[PDB]
């Protein structure tokens, strides 16, 4: 299923609504009206850049700046 | 996904009627009567059950079960 | 002009029903721009307690953790809002005085000795529908000396939170605070709060003959009592209060003027529906208290500026 | 303590330690996940 | 830490001046006003909400004679609070009435 | 309108509309610009409230 229901009342109660602008109650936007989240999954390979040795990814022995 | 806690329009607690909903289902009421007996009057709370569709009893099958 | 006693002769508050989490009382004799103030103060001002900080240890369920964190907030604590202070600015720790502290932990596993069936998980599982009774209050400092048992608890012990399958577990540690109804929306102590003006159905003609059929169907369930002084049904209003203005009288070209639909000027009817933090009576009282206190603040400020 | 991983197709730990293949030393199939360390983390719920 | 502040009109003084409350809504600025209105010495009394993303209102008060507006203002506050006091009294009285009644009904 | 007090007739599309021989039209010609603009904004506000 693709979308989520809603209650419409069609009045010129604010002026705000014209040329397709619309107002949404702030509470029923806190109560969970169609909250979203996106998964972007970047990808990396260290074989992309040709370097010497057995470069693979790991935190070095060297003390990394302890942040 | 899972049933939301408080209704959207007004604010009632609806995050519990689901189990008793399926209950009064097995007792074979026509849903109009079920949402009545569950005590919901203003319709903006009824369309929260008359049209919910559960997506964890169909999404858990891919569980990394053990 | 204004005069106290002229008014105070008029005001009366008739109650028509109260039970647990319900209230309905006529405020006949006040002017709109005060009733509106009561309703606003209810839906926005009676302070309440709620969850606003969840700490995660090892979430390994399908329900991603951000959404669990926000799905918690709506949960109502069943504790007293009057016995705390607004959390002093910052200080995530705070004091005793500005916090509850709950805890949730439901590590799930299989069913020890299950049959062949695999019909329902309740026979196949244990701890797979994490409810709220798996939450347990924790004390801070002298909370023990302060409160008795059986109070600090969410209000229903039935609000489904998650769903697990063997191998997955959760570990939370909440943080409760105090706030108002306009800083957010998980603070409304009531479902609804409204008022409609008593409708007043005056037959500008005596209706008669066979109109009774369509009249009785022109209105709400029981309004016109068909009355038979001579076995011949006539109509009169049983209760003008029980209607919502169907206005389904006008579609009949004839019965558009033999009746009259209107409103009595000031006959408001509140109706409060509490969640359960407090029963509606203390709610109304607290609303009025905060209005009066606001006005006192303004007045004393005007005084101390001069 | 050390790093842990799980084989995808059969779900049996593999614990990559040395400089070595990336195959589940039992499970022929080969693609890996990571596993969750119990940690503390702040998360608002407004 | 102001919570009430007035800016004195250029045209005249102290029969037309305009107030600036803080931290408010259409609750006070629509009850207080209706209360002031009943007073007959006042000419003009109206309010607005200067800004949606802030919460402060604007109160305008104008009077026939030469007495400043502080007097109608203050008497309005007082009128309203005494009203609410009486209302609360009647409320709780009626509450306990019907409660003890309901108990008496079912005993 | 006679001396700034309308006496009969509606305000239809013509006057507050942007056409020749309108209200905000003529205000601007003989008073300046700023006052015509103020008329427009204030009249709109009344019309919303």
From Swiss-Prot, chain A:
Physiological role: Catalytic core component of RNA polymerase I (Pol I), a DNA-dependent RNA polymerase which synthesizes ribosomal RNA precursors using the four ribonucleoside triphosphates as substrates. Transcribes 47S pre-rRNAs from multicopy rRNA gene clusters, giving rise to 5.8S, 18S and 28S ribosomal RNAs. Pol I-mediated transcription cycle proceeds through transcription initiation, transcription elongation and transcription termination stages.
Disease with which this protein is associated in UniProt: Treacher Collins syndrome 4: A form of Treacher Collins syndrome, a disorder of craniofacial development. Treacher Collins syndrome is characterized by a combination of bilateral downward slanting of the palpebral fissures, colobomas of the lower eyelids with a paucity of eyelashes medial to the defect, hypoplasia of the facial bones, cleft palate, malformation of the external ears, atresia of the external auditory canals, and bilateral conductive hearing loss. TCS4 inheritance pattern is autosomal dominant.
Family: Belongs to the RNA polymerase beta chain family.
Domains: entry comment: The active site comprises the fork loops, the loops and the rudder that stabilize the transcription bubble and assist polymerase translocation.
Lineage of the organism: Eukaryota, Metazoa, Chordata, Craniata, Vertebrata
Sequence positions that bind Mg(2+): 20
Subcellular location field: Nucleus, Nucleolus; Chromosome
Portion of the full sequence shown: 736 to 802 of 1135
UniProtKB/Swiss-Prot annotation, chain B:
Binding site for Zn(2+): 7, 10, 44-45
Pfam families: RNA_pol_N
Keywords attached to this entry: DNA-directed RNA polymerase, Metal-binding, Nucleus, Transcription, Zinc
Alphabetized PROSITE patterns for the sequence: RNA_POL_N_8KD
Alphabetical list of InterPro entries matching this protein: RNA_pol_su_RPB10, RNA_pol_suN_Zn-BS, RPABC5/Rpb10
Signal peptide (UniProt feature, chain positions): none
GO biological process: regulation of transcription by RNA polymerase I; transcription by RNA polymerase I; transcription by RNA polymerase II; tRNA transcription by RNA polymerase III
Subcellular location: Nucleus; Nucleus, Nucleolus
GO cellular component: cytosol; nucleoplasm; nucleus; RNA polymerase I complex; RNA polymerase II, core complex; RNA polymerase III complex
Disulfide bonds: none
Source superkingdom: Eukaryota
HAMAP family, alphabetized: RNApol_arch_Rpo10
Known partners and oligomeric status: Component of the RNA polymerase I (Pol I), RNA polymerase II (Pol II) and RNA polymerase III (Pol III) complexes consisting of at least 13, 12 and 17 subunits, respectively. Pol I complex consists of a ten-subunit catalytic core composed of POLR1A/RPA1, POLR1B/RPA2, POLR1C/RPAC1, POLR1D/RPAC2, POLR1H/RPA12, POLR2E/RPABC1, POLR2F/RPABC2, POLR2H/RPABC3, POLR2K/RPABC4 and POLR2L/RPABC5; a mobile stalk subunit POLR1F/RPA43 protruding from the core and additional subunits homologous to general transcription factors POLR1E/RPA49 and POLR1G/RPA34.
Sequence similarity: Belongs to the archaeal Rpo10/eukaryotic RPB10 RNA polymerase subunit family.
Name of the protein described by the UniProt record: DNA-directed RNA polymerases I, II, and III subunit RPABC5
Species for this entry: Homo sapiens
Record lineage: Eukaryota, Metazoa, Chordata, Craniata, Vertebrata
Swiss-Prot record, chain C:
Keywords: Acetylation, Cytoplasm, Disease variant, DNA-directed RNA polymerase, Leukodystrophy, Nucleus, Phosphoprotein, Transcription
Main location group: nucleus
Cell membrane is among the record's keywords: no
GO biological process: transcription by RNA polymerase I
GO cellular component term of the entry, any: cytosol
Subcellular location: Nucleus; Nucleus, Nucleolus; Cytoplasm, Cytosol
Highest taxon above the source species: Eukaryota
Illness: Treacher Collins syndrome 3: A form of Treacher Collins syndrome, a disorder of craniofacial development. Treacher Collins syndrome is characterized by a combination of bilateral downward slanting of the palpebral fissures, colobomas of the lower eyelids with a paucity of eyelashes medial to the defect, hypoplasia of the facial bones, cleft palate, malformation of the external ears, atresia of the external auditory canals, and bilateral conductive hearing loss. Leukodystrophy, hypomyelinating, 11: An autosomal recessive neurologic disorder characterized by brain hypomyelination, delayed psychomotor development, intellectual disability, tremor and other neurologic symptoms. Some patients may additionally manifest non-neurologic features, particularly dental abnormalities and hypogonadotropic hypogonadism.
HAMAP family found in the cross-reference section: RNApol_arch_Rpo3 (MF_00320)
Name by which UniProt lists this protein: DNA-directed RNA polymerases I and III subunit RPAC1
Organism in which the protein naturally occurs: Homo sapiens (Human)
Gene name tied to this protein: POLR1C
Swiss-Prot record, chain F:
Subcellular compartments: Nucleus, Nucleolus; Chromosome
The organism's place on the tree of life at top rank: Eukaryota
Family in the record: Belongs to the RNA polymerase beta' chain family.
Disease as annotated in the protein's UniProt record: Acrofacial dysostosis, Cincinnati type: A form of acrofacial dysostosis, a group of disorders characterized by malformations of the craniofacial skeleton and, in some patients, the limbs. AFDCIN patients may also have structural cardiac defects and neurologic abnormalities including developmental delay, hypotonia, motor delay and seizures. AFDCIN inheritance is autosomal dominant.
Entry text on domains: The clamps form the DNA-binding cleft.
Function according to Swiss-Prot or TrEMBL: Catalytic core component of RNA polymerase I (Pol I), a DNA-dependent RNA polymerase which synthesizes ribosomal RNA precursors using the four ribonucleoside triphosphates as substrates. Transcribes 47S pre-rRNAs from multicopy rRNA gene clusters, giving rise to 5.8S, 18S and 28S ribosomal RNAs. Pol I-mediated transcription cycle proceeds through transcription initiation, transcription elongation and transcription termination stages.
Protein name: DNA-directed RNA polymerase I subunit RPA1
